Amino acid sequence: QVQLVQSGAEVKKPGSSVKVSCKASGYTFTSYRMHWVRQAPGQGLEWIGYINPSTGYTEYNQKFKDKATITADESTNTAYMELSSLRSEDTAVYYCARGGGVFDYWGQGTLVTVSSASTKGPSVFPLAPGTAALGCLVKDYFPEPVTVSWNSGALTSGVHTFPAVLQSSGLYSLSSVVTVPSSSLGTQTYICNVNHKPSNTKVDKKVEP
């Protein structure tokens, strides 16, 4: 219908390189130059550059000339953006966007994480005490993301699941908490469903005092 689909998340080591893809649908691919932009935490939008799928011609932002090579593939209807010499500062969401006038149509973004860290499942620890709060500490994992649900999806109200922080160790950590009636404590079951896909780690943690 005019929709750009990018490839999935990437997790790369410093010094390495990665090639992201953006497949187009809903128009004739060569009639519009394809741009790329990055959004780094503290979400600042910066334009990287474009390719013209017809000429093969490219224009780049100075800031990104050392970093990005943008190529296109006319047969497959996809544009590529290759990032080389990866360093932790390259950690960002990347978009492709159509080049007809202003960017009307965007891809859904690809998250790219650059880190010397290695895949590791989280340790999960209980957070334990009208109302009381409890939760789980989801600690020492890499990379993002993690999902936390409660009682296999039955509890949703009062659940806060905090954004992850990056420790000096290069490993993430987060808490997910929920409030509960205090008379239920020794008797009602509360379970953390923690899911860490990147390391295939699923743990169901029951929380009690």
């Binding site: 939008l45 209980p126 957070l127 806060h160 905090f162």
Partner: protein
């Protein structure tokens, strides 16, 4: 290259307000465009070439200005409009975007509920202790959280994390996490989280003594 400073950086406003966001370029530019963005989405085009509305975009949005001074106005603020807004320059290379302006929901004071959590024994066995303070459902975001370890004010060894505004009541919730080695943790007795906020006339202190 050409940069745009937006005004204001952050704005708290109520439904039905008149919102005026300024985009100040550093050198002469011909046209300005405005995007809107909500967490986890690619931005949407609202205004193209200084003052032209994009299809589907409500007529409560307007744009104006020339040279290096451009504005976006929301004449009557709606619930869908709470988001980030960026001005965009597309007439010199590199194409550049404004710093953004965050428009948040104004509502009334609400004191947080404070809870402190000692490290589990399970974590203790690994050699690291985490202590956690929770501030639940408060407004405004501004809040002071002082960790005290046998009355010694801690500075630099905790990390904070803050929910986005709650879609129903527009409150926030916050977790401050203190990290210590097992051996260091065992050197002290009283662990305290002290919360300062405007909805509290006095600061609230939650504590425990190491050893149940």
């Amino acid at each position: 290259d050409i940069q745009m400073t937006q005004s204001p950086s952050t704005l708290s406003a109520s439904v039905g307000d008149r919102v005026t966001i300024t985009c100040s370029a550093s050198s002469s530019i011909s046209y300005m465009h405005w995007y809107q963005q909500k967490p986890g989405k690619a931005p949407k085009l609202l205004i193209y070439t200084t003052s032209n509305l994009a299809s589907g975009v409500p007529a409560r949005f307007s744009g104006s200005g020339s040279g290096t001074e451009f504005t976006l106005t929301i004449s009557s603020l709606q619930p869908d409009d709470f988001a980030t807004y960026y001005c965009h320059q597309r007439s010199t290379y590199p194409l550049t975007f404004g710093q953004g302006t965050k428009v948040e929901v104004k509502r009334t004071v609400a004191a947080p509920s404070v809870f402190i959590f000692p490290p589990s024994d399970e974590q203790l066995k690994s050699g690291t202790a985490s202590v956690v303070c929770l501030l639940n459902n408060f407004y405004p975001r501004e809040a002071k959280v002082q960790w005290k370890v046998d009355n010694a004010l801690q500075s630099g060894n905790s990390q904070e994390s803050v929910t986005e505004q709650d879609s129903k009541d527009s409150t926030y919730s916050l977790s401050s996490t203190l990290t210590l080695s097992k051996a260091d943790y065992e050197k002290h007795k009283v662990y305290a989280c002290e919360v300062t906020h405007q909805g509290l006339s006095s600061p609230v202190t939650k504590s425990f003594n190491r050893g149940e």
